[PDB]
Amino acid sequence: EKENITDPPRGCVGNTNIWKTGPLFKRVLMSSKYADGVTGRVEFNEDGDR
């Protein structure tokens, strides 16, 4: 849904430049709020836990 869609390239062939939207995708994982689940209401905290 957001912009700057970048992809982690084939880093195993001649690529050492890091993926710049790494912390962006990690922040997307941080704001992962859910109310559905067999285990229950799953949501990541500031430490990335249940």
Binding site: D7, P8, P9, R10, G11, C12, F25
Partner: protein, 75 residues
């Protein structure tokens, strides 16, 4: 376009429900142009060859999230 999703995933029951969840992710999200593509790697007791399987199966796959789903290792 297409998204590879890779996991340490060998015992075939979670192969089956993992492909089922791939189908469900393309089911409850409308008709958006994204597609999914599974990637499963198996057990290796030696973690060097675990990392070898990860690097020669997941870097070229361009995965976004990798899931380790095998606790009961004999080591």
């Amino acid at each position: 376009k297409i998204v590879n999703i890779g996991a340490v995933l060998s015992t075939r029951k979670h192969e089956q429900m993992f492909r089922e969840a791939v189908n469900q992710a393309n089911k409850r999200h409308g008709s958006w142009k994204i597609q999914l593509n599974a990637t499963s790697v198996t057990h290796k007791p030696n973690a060097i060859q675990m990392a070898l399987s990860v690097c020669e199966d997941l870097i070229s796959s361009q995965v976004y999230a990798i899931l380790v789903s095998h606790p009961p290792t004999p080591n």
